[PDB]
Write a protein that binds this DNA or RNA. Structure first.
Lengths: 252, 169, 385, 25, 26, 389, 49, 358, 102
RNA sequence: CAUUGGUGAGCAGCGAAGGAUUUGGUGGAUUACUAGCUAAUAGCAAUCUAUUUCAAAGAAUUCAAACUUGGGGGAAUGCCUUGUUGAAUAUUCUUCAAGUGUAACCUCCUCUCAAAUCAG
């Protein structure tokens, strides 16, 4: 490789570890509601108090979000940054974050969800540190400007590469971009790994699920000619159909 | 580096990081600017000979005046340095210390020569044309931009044949 | 003493059956925290020559110099890279003089002083050879020992030569500057390291360090113990405070190319395909004599603390990050940062050096240091005299 | 794909604002 | 999707030594 | 009438690499820019092989009996040549830069100094047909720290010692059961040990270094092993060695100094026979025969070769070619004569078979450009940039 | 085989708020502070000048 | 038959033939030993540069190839070559006139099977010694014990236990003693390909049906099965890199990649080797590397890699399909017309009924 | 005339592994790493074409052949090259061939 | 009218389940192939560590050691050299001069061009 690409790879290894103070005022200043001049001057405790202030209403809506008060929204869970942890601890952090994401995927029209996950964005860099679950849990909300804000904040993975023109855009991402996002093959292996994750965890709600079928169906719409591409598309859809029917759920 | 204070200035009386006396005013670079030489050491490849001119020009001025070797050897110096064209005149002896600059030997460089003859628009475009392999000095196409070309070789620089830039003119 | 907020990392055997040195760097990279495990770099830049390494005194910028054309100043922790120069002359060493904005490279002929962007600031008419190019920021003095007998001191604050000292020793085979004392240490083929101040034209004291030529030398943070290696497969542990070699490690399998000293007391010995560091080896007892193999697991005999073997290389030089627990080993294809547990100090003093420094903090601190430079006559055998 | 006349870019005495003779304008 | 081949170096690993399996006579 | 094949290259008498005589003192092997020329001294003829190397030659030897020729590049291209047959037998590629190839006095196996590695290979067989991979590496000895710069066998094949730019000069055997008989190393010098040697009796060891030093190693007492009985310094002041050989059966050191000087010694005595200023230009290679009455120098500052006797003050050939400066070439009406001009001014006169400048004319001061023959090859002229013909 | 390293933790030394001033950890260990006579001397000479 | 003017030098232009090649390691790096009739070839895996060739043409064609670290074991008709660097260091001529079918190396032993359903055992003369030269014994497989011997493998951590698999079943021997320590029951299909495993106790078997069986011996049980519709399996391999992946090589030329944790095929490669010339003859993952070296009967030897996984969040689920890497090919059919191309005897054009130049 | 890498205009196609990021891999000044002081000394004036000495081109030597002539008798042609005088001939089978060697 | 200009329509014409273009990535060659690592006759390659350490061998220009400096001046203050003075015990060091002495240290040069513009 070149030196410059071998060193810009180390940017990807430490995109969240703020070393200079300008890296902090880049890394802390992006969040889900607050403008970056007011988002620059936020103490951690002040954001966590708003986090609990939305999290208590969320836990009172359904009790399953009460456990993240025990671990993620603990008052002891402020000072700990991710990069100070071992990767075996980081895996359990990502487990908590992921299981929270498919959980809050239903509740995302609520400003409680927007005020709850914004702290998780700011305390655990989940726009960057775990962005595949951030996007896959919140993929169906492509018309909503909360997600459109989220697009301007997420370090885009290669798997979600249709929206490389839509980060920091005015108009929302169109319906055809959902098909072109899904028209890839390995994206569909990610969406199996999302939906199969939601099946065993039984966190499968209707609106996102209708978006799933509308995207998968439009994929086979787009593959009406490419019969060889269709013949490698049977393993991804019929597995989702089979593992979907193992649900107790009737919408699934 | 700092637009430092009235109280900072008097304590840091002699310091500088930009123009040093060992760095000799960055004078060489102003010749590396005006003639666009690739490596730095081309300057000091002229300036190591340039004093060597004066180091012979000085001690031939220390001989007795009508020493019949002295006026002959100085003529042999001056016809040589006039064949290479590094001085404009040859009648006076005083050019051997006053006209022998790095810029004067460096305006006998090849793209300076083509830049005089207006085959090229600027200097660096002639350097680009030598790099592209468009130019030749009589028989030989030259690849090197840093060609010392004498006064008598100066008629021999043409464009090379069958090119795309000789058909451009 | 209790204000000291951060404590060192350790490495513990946990059994006599389990061994300390047998840990490998992929095995280390499991348990180290993610930023610190990721701070190990693998820069294989195999096209140019073997690579020379220097971190700045704060770890914020790495400077590397391949033997063929490479000159590279990265803002190492982040993705930023300041300088990338390809001079077709061959180079030997490089150091940042004051900050990452200004550095100096040791070429075939002339030292060069350079901008952060890669521009040319100052070519030195003098320094006609440059083998070891080292700095002391407390005098703003770039001290350079080439293949010449001489030794040159350039005061880059003023930008002028201070002095030039002919050793009558020949080509300089090693040079390590003292952090605590700013006395320079030159090592030559007789087995002789000379201590140096720019004033005294004869050396402060000559030391018949070993037999054969001096491979390298490296000095403590405290300036107490300087670890010298000859090419005679031997390494002496000099205690400079009373001018005694504490231990004489004889018959290495191969003579160490370099030696390096961490802050907390680690010693790095690089025979070139192998890098081996000892913990607390510089202490007074011969129980603390660094030894390769302790038979029977005796606590008196001392084993190496951390080991590594480079497969396809013979490494050039090495230097710890001064505030972190890694060391950059420059190999033929590039750079590894080998993760130590307790090499660097955990609690830096910000008012001495700033590993976390704003550019405005930097231009404040640079002017602070230039006010507090010492003129060159103050380089002495004791700081306090 | 490298541009021709790869020259040593160095200190411009007429353009570098770090010079105090060009500290005015 | 950026489907590009990356440069893939051989990294070292470890395998079982099948030549260590025999015990001699009693 | 169409088919023209390469016959012979002439001149540019030394560029880079090792010089050697054969078993007999007739055949002298020199490198050319990439080829090997052979000059036969008594039967005065010259020859250059039909092949060329791909880079400049940095290592050369021929067989014991004159059957195999090994040329090795700077990079380590190795070319096996049927020396008697002038045809290439094998192109091996050594991947390191090697400095010395020496055949056995046995002729059974050769060895190679590449890096800190010694590689000891069996000889390929000449009367056998050419194979795909003829070379069999017998052993590899890597007990050295820096690049191995010089190397010799004993007069028996059973002992080989090599010397590096590292301080060490180390002996081993061919066979490992002869390891325990003698396997040790030598140290205690100052510098690049530039040549270490066996004496003609295999009990005395001479080790010579770059600084100007020789040690006389001997398996002697204070079991007991291998002390220095004496040292020897020529006391060259700033000058230092470049090349050194030792003819053992007459106990003779040939030295080459950086100042172009050269000395001769008688090694149990260490007595200066004569000092010759070979020139300003250093001896880049020394060589002796097995008879040891001719010496061969090459200055790669000029590009000259010099065969001179040590005992009688007498040269054999003092050849000094000029690279890039072969301006004119002229066949006579006779097919026995050839004229080469130059930019240095020398105009040489060659026989086609016996490739020697029989005549020269060093009377032009500048470049000689064009030369034609006339009147049955009697008269031969030389127009010049020297302002004359 | 207990493996423990140094961790700056990237939050203690670089603060959360942009308006917050830097944290300044000091170690008055004399090995970190090489010149207690000479640097104080130059400060005194600066003050007198 | 001997020529006086010319002599054979090598048969230029061959990479492999279809005989199941062997893999070996020098330190960290890999070499590949393939067969071409009576002459074997050695390759670096990281460039497919040719490393060694046989010192001699063998008098009959090589039937089997195994390879330990510095010693490559060829097996032609009755005799077995112990080769260092392609040079015949020790010929081990078996005490039958039966033809050597298969071969394996473990411990101080060598084990090679013949077509008389009898395996020969060759001890080292010492564990201090490196190549096996002492003849130990001959054990056999009678038709109550097993069928025709398909492979001999040694699964790891099995002290002197020899795993001889047939078309029918699996046997285990103490080759110090010579006693059958265990016989497996018959699998109802015709077993065609064996492979050991980076998990303990498991031998993978690909039968004449499209079925791969993971089989224990401490259990003696067939733990999992894997189906393939209508393909005859030829080679099995395990990716020991860091995700559990299985390689199924057909004789139809197709290479099928499984992840046994997801219980799913990953990608099936089609037609990496010619079906008429044996299909995929042998494919093997380089141990602890994401590189599989495949070898066909079309004089071709390819390399393929798994790219590292694109899913940062998942990893193991989203798998890049295998991707073409370097290959040395030859003419699949014999060459119809050749010529000498250049003047310096560097290049030769060779055109075949494979319908290509080379 | 000659097949030499160190001779400059020998190769038709250059090996792209030597074409680095900025520059050739061989155009880097490697004379500065010699052990000897004299070989580390550079005296090369910049733009010397076929001037006085070899070291002062600051280049590889160009493969050039200056002078060309035929023999009268056996149609042999000799050309004085950069490497030196080469001889081609029709005096075939002067290649010496030992027979039946022990 | 030549358009010998292309757009633009078209058509003859070519023409097997598309044609034409543009580019990213990677692999292969771009010198003639003998395996990787190490402390190397051997061991490794799952490992060299609780045989790697004892042992031997191992120390000159009695201090040769800028082969490297743009050129002139000078070279105050330094250094060098001898002249010369004191002290200590045949040598360092105090003191002092003479040096078209000096790669320290001060200045002058090593920029102003038939390049172009511009009044006349």
């Amino acid at each position: 490789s070149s030196l410059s690409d071998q060193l810009a790879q180390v940017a990807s290894n430490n995109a969240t570890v703020a070393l200079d103070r300008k890296r902090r005022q880049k890394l802390h200043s992006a969040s889900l509601i607050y403008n970056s001049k007011t988002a620059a001057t936020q103490d951690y405790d002040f954001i966590f108090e708003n986090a609990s202030k939305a999290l208590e209403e969320l836990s009172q809506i359904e009790p399953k979000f009460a456990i993240f008060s025990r671990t993620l929204f603990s008052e002891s869970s402020i000072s700990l940054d991710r990069n100070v942890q071992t990767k075996e601890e980081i895996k359990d952090l990502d487990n908590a974050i992921n299981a929270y994401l498919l959980l809050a995927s239903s509740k995302w029209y609520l400003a409680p969800t927007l005020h709850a996950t914004e702290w998780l964005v700011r305390r655990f860099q989940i726009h960057v540190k775990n962005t595949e679950m951030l996007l896959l849990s919140t993929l169906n909300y492509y018309q909503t400007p909360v997600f459109k804000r989220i697009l301007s904040i997420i370090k885009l993975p290669p798997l979600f590469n249709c929206l490389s023109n839509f980060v920091r855009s005015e108009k929302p991402p169109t319906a055809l971009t959902m098909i072109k996002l899904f028209n890839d093959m390995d994206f569909l292996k990610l969406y199996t790994s999302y939906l199969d994750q939601c099946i065993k965890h039984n966190a499968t709600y209707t609106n996102q699920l209708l978006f799933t079928t509308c995207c998968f169906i439009n994929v086979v719409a787009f593959n009406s000619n490419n019969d060889e591409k269709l013949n490698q598309l049977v393993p991804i859809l019929l597995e989702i159909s089979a593992k979907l029917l193992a649900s107790k759920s009737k919408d699934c | 580096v700092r637009k430092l204070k009235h109280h900072e200035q008097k304590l840091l009386k002699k310091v500088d990081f930009l123009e040093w006396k060992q760095d000799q005013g960055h004078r060489d670079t102003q010749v590396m600017r005006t003639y666009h030489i690739q490596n730095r050491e081309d300057y000091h490849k002229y300036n190591r000979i340039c004093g060597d001119i004066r180091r012979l020009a000085n001690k031939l001025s220390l001989l007795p005046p009508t020493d019949p070797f002295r006026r002959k050897h100085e003529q042999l110096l001056l016809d040589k340095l006039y064949a290479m064209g590094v001085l404009t005149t040859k009648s006076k002896i005083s050019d051997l210390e006053n006209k022998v600059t790095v810029s004067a030997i460096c305006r006998r460089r090849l793209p300076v020569i083509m830049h005089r003859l207006k085959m090229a628009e600027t200097i660096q475009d002639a350097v680009k044309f030598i790099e592209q392999g468009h130019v030749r000095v009589g028989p030989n196409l030259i690849n090197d931009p840093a060609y010392l070309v004498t006064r008598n070789m100066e008629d021999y620089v043409t464009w090379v044949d069958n090119s795309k830039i000789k058909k451009t003119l | 003493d209790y204000l000291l907020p951060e404590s060192n990392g350790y490495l513990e055997p946990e059994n006599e059956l389990e061994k300390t040195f047998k840990v490998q760097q992929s095995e280390i990279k499991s348990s180290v925290d993610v930023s610190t495990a990721n701070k190990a770099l693998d820069l294989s830049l195999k096209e140019f020559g073997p690579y020379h390494i220097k971190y700045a005194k704060n770890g914020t910028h790495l400077l590397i110099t391949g033997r063929k054309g490479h000159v590279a100043s990265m803002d190492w922790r982040k993705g930023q890279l300041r300088a990338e120069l390809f001079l077709n002359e061959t180079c030997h060493s490089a150091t940042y003089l004051q900050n990452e904005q200004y550095f100096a490279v040791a070429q075939k002929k002339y030292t060069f002083i350079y901008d952060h962007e890669g521009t040319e600031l100052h070519r030195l008419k003098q320094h006609i050879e440059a083998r070891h190019l080292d700095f002391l920021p407390y005098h703003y003095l770039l001290v350079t020992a080439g293949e010449t007998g001489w030794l040159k001191y350039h005061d880059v604050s003023t930008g002028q030569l201070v002095s030039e000292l002919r050793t009558k020793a020949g080509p300089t085979m090693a040079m390590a500057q003292n952090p605590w004392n700013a006395v320079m240490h030159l090592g030559h083929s007789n087995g002789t390291v000379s201590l140096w101040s720019p004033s005294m034209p004869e050396p402060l004291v000559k030391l018949l360090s070993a037999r054969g030529p001096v491979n390298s030398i490296a000095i403590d943070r405290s300036g107490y113990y300087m670890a010298t290696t000859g090419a005679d497969r031997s390494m002496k542990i000099w205690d400079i405070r009373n001018f005694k070699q504490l231990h004489s490690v004889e018959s290495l399998p191969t003579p160490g190319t370099n030696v390096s000293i961490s802050d907390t007391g680690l010693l790095a010995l690089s025979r070139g395909p192998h890098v081996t560091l000892w913990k607390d080896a510089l202490k007074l007892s011969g129980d603390s004599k660094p030894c390769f193999g302790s038979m029977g697991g005796n606590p008196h005999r001392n084993t190496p603390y951390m080991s590594h073997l480079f497969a396809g290389n013979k490494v050039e030089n090495l230097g710890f990050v001064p505030f972190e627990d890694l060391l950059g080993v420059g190999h033929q294809t590039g750079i590894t940062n080998l993760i130590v547990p307790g090499a660097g100090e955990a609690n830096y003093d910000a008012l001495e050096l700033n590993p976390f420094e704003t550019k405005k903090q930097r231009q404040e601190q640079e002017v602070r240091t230039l006010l507090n430079k010492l003129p060159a006559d103050t380089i002495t055998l004791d700081p306090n005299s | 794909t490298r541009k021709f006349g790869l020259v040593k870019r160095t200190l411009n005495t007429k353009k570098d604002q770090r010079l105090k003779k060009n500290q005015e304008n | 999707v950026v489907r590009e081949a990356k440069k893939v170096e051989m990294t070292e690993a470890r395998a079982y030594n099948a030549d260590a399996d025999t015990a001699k006579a009693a | 009438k169409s088919d023209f094949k390469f016959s012979n290259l002439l001149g540019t008498v030394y560029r880079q690499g090792n010089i050697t005589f054969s078993d007999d003192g007739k055949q002298l092997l020199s490198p050319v820019g990439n080829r090997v020329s052979v000059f036969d001294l008594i039967n005065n003829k010259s020859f250059t092989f039909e092949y060329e190397h791909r880079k400049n030659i940095a290592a050369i030897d021929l067989n014991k009996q004159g059957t195999l020729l090994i040329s090795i590049d700077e990079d380590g291209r190795a070319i096996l040549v049927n020396f008697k047959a002038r045809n290439v037998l094998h192109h091996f590629n050594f991947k390191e830069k090697c400095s010395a190839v020496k055949f056995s006095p046995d002729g059974r196996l050769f060895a190679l100094a590449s890096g800190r590695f010694l590689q000891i290979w069996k000889t390929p067989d000449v009367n056998k047909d050419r194979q795909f991979a003829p070379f069999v590496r017998h052993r590899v000895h890597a007990g050295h720290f820096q690049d191995i710069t010089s190397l010799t066998w004993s007069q028996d094949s059973r002992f080989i010692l090599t010397t590096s730019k590292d301080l060490s000069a180390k002996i081993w055997s061919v066979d490992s059961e002869e390891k325990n008989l003698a396997a040790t190393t030598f140290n205690g010098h100052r510098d690049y040990v530039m040549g270490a040697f066996f004496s003609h009796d295999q009990e005395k060891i001479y080790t010579v270094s770059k600084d100007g030093a020789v040690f006389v190693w001997e398996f002697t007492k204070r079991k007991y092993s291998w002390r220095i009985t004496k040292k020897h310094f020529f006391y060259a002041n700033q000058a230092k060695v470049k090349c050194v050989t030792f003819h053992p059966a007459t106990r003779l050191l040939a030295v080459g100094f950086t100042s172009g000087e050269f000395r001769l010694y008688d090694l149990p005595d260490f007595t200066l026979i004569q000092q010759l200023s070979m020139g300003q230009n250093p001896v880049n290679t020394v060589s002796v025969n097995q008879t040891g009455e001719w010496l061969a120098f090459g200055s790669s500052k000029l590009g000259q070769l010099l065969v001179y006797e040590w005992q009688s003050e007498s040269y054999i050939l003092k050849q000094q070619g000029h690279f890039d400066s072969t301006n004119s070439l002229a066949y006579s009406p006779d097919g026995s004569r050839v004229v080469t001009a130059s930019e240095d001014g020398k105009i040489k006169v060659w026989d086609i078979t016996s490739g020697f400048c029989l005549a020269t004319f060093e009377e032009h001061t500048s470049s000689v450009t064009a030369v034609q023959f006339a009147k049955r090859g009697q008269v031969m002229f030389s127009s010049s940039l020297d302002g004359t013909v | 085989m207990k493996i423990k390293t140094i961790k700056r933790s990237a939050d203690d030394y670089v603060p959360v708020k942009s308006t917050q001033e830097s944290q300044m950890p000091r170690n008055l260990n004399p090995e970190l502070h090489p010149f207690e006579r000479a640097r104080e001397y130059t400060k005194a000479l600066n003050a007198t000048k | 038959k001997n020529s006086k003017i010319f002599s054979p030098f090598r048969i230029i232009g061959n990479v492999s033939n279809g005989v199941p090649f062997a893999t070996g390691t020098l330190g960290s790096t890999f070499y590949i030993v393939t067969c071409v009739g009576k002459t074997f070839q050695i390759y670096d895996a990281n460039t497919l540069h040719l490393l060694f060739v046989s010192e001699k043409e063998t008098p009959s064609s090589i039937v089997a190839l195994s390879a330990h670290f510095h010693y490559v074991y060829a097996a032609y008709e009755n005799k077995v070559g112990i080769y260092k660097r392609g040079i015949e260091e020790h010929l081990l001529e078996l005490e039958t006139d039966a033809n050597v079918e298969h071969l394996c190396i473990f411990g101080d032993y060598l084990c090679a099977s013949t077509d008389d359903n009898s395996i020969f055992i060759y001890k080292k003369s010492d564990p201090q010694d490196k190549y096996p030269s002492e003849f130990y014994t001959k054990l056999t497989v009678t038709e109550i014990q097993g069928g025709e011997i398909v492979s001999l493998q040694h699964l790891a951590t099995y002290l002197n236990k020899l795993t001889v698999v047939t078309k029918s079943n699996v046997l285990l021997f103490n080759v110090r003693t010579g006693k059958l320590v265990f016989t497996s029951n018959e699998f109802p299909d015709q077993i065609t390909t064996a492979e050991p495993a980076p998990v303990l106790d498991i031998i993978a078997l690909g039968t004449v049906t499209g079925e791969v069986i993971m089989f224990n011996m401490r259990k003696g049980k067939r733990i999992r099965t894997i189906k393939i519709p209508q393909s005859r399996i030829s080679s099995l391999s395990f990716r020991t890199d860091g995700s559990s992946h299985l390689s199924v090589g057909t004789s139809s030329g197709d290479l099928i990649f499984y992840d046994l944790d997801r219980r799913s095929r990953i990608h099936v490669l089609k037609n990496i080797h010619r079906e008429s010339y044996g299909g995929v003859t042998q494919a093997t993952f380089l141990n602890g590397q994401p590189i599989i070296v495949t070898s066909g009967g079309d004089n071709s030897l390819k390399e393929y890699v798994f790219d590292p996984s694109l899913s940062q969040g998942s990893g193991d689920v989203v798998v890049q399909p295998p991707r073409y890497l370097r290959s040395r090919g030859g003419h699949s059919q014999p060459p119809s017309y050749i010529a000498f191309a250049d003047s310096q005897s560097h290049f030769m054009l060779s055109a075949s009924k494979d319908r290509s130049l080379w | 005339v000659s097949r030499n890498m160190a001779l400059n205009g020998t190769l038709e196609f250059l090996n792209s592994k030597k074409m680095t990021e900025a520059g050739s891999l061989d155009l880097i000044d490697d004379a500065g790493e010699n052990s000897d002081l004299e070989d580390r000394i550079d005296n090369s004036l910049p733009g010397s074409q076929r001037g006085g000495d070899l070291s002062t081109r600051k280049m590889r030597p160009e493969v050039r052949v200056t002078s060309v002539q035929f023999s009268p008798t056996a149609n042999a042609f000799a050309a004085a090259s950069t490497e030196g005088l080469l001889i081609y001939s029709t005096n075939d089978t002067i290649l010496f061939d030992p027979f039946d060697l022990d």
